[PDB]
């Protein structure tokens, strides 16, 4: 359970950082 | 399409001068109002799943060669469901023989 | 801006057209404007994706084709 939840959270964070590398809602290591 | 009323032939557009009049080869002219004033367009949206695969998506639950996954259909509660993956965007669509379409299509 | 008929699909452009005219009164439709037009809808997702500003688009277009007259709406 811990591995799965860490993996899903990290993947969500990865996608979020990938989208907002320069953009604003309204940085490589994490 | 503008067809000549008398002889049912294709009528050219002839964009003159402030208005548009459709002229046939037999001379008939039928003028133009508002909706005739579009010349050409090319919309940018790389999507044809709504019509290109409409027949395919409808027929998919009956296709024996389609991949199935172990999920319950919200409408009829079969425990298996055929899975479609369409296009470059790899859109995943879940369909069933009962008509369920999973919010896509 | 007399009345003029447009394509009734894009007929509601006059309300923002007047907004453009009052907000950009340095430039007005030139006397040589022909009976031909191009309506272009910007991809907001791409211009926010690559950080392209609307002013940049319009000034580049009007500097590259003064032979053509361009009108821009408010977008931010
Ligand atoms: Zn005819
Ligand atoms: Zn079903």
UniProtKB/TrEMBL annotation, chain A:
<protein>
    <submittedName>
        <fullName>M1249L</fullName>
    </submittedName>
</protein>
From TrEMBL, chain B:
<protein>
    <submittedName>
        <fullName>C122R</fullName>
    </submittedName>
</protein>
UniProtKB/TrEMBL annotation, chain C:
<comment type="function">
    <text>Catalytic component of the DNA-directed RNA polymerase (RNAP) that catalyzes the transcription in the cytoplasm of viral DNA into RNA using the four ribonucleoside triphosphates as substrates. Forms the polymerase active center together with RPB2. Part of the core element with the central large cleft, the clamp element that moves to open and close the cleft and the jaws that are thought to grab the incoming DNA template.</text>
</comment>
<comment type="function">
    <text>DNA-dependent RNA polymerase catalyzes the transcription of DNA into RNA using the four ribonucleoside triphosphates as substrates.</text>
</comment>
<protein>
    <recommendedName>
        <fullName>DNA-directed RNA polymerase subunit</fullName>
    </recommendedName>
</protein>
<comment type="subunit">
    <text>Part of the viral DNA-directed RNA polymerase that consists of 8 polII-like subunits (RPB1, RPB2, RPB3, RPB5, RPB6, RPB7, RPB9, RPB10), a capping enzyme and a termination factor.</text>
</comment>
<comment type="similarity">
    <text>Belongs to the RNA polymerase beta' chain family.</text>
</comment>
């Amino acid at each position: 359970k811990k591995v799965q939840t860490a993996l899903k959270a990290s993947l969500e964070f990865n996608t979020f950082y990938a989208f907002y590398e320069s953009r604003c809602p309204k940085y490589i290591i994490y | 399409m503008k067809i000549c009323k008398a002889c049912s032939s294709c009528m050219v557009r002839t964009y003159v001068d402030g208005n548009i009049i459709f002229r046939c080869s037999c001379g008939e002219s039928v003028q133009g109002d508002s909706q005739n004033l579009l010349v050409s367009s090319k919309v940018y949206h790389t999507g044809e799943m709504e019509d290109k695969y409409k027949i395919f998506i409808k027929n998919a639950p009956f296709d024996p060669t389609n991949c199935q996954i172990k999920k319950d259909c919200p409408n009829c509660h079969l425990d298996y469901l055929t899975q479609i993956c369409i296009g470059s965007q790899k859109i995943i669509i879940l369909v069933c023989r009962c008509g369920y379409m999973s919010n896509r299509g | 801006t007399k009345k003029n008929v447009m394509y009734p699909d894009f007929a509601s452009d006059v309300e923002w057209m007047t907004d453009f005219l009052e907000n950009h009164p340095l430039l007005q439709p030139p006397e040589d404007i022909a009976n031909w037009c191009i309506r272009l809808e910007l991809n907001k997702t791409t211009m926010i994706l690559k950080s392209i500003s609307l002013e940049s688009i319009i000034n580049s277009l009007r500097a590259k084709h003064p032979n053509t007259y361009i009108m821009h709406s408010v977008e931010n």
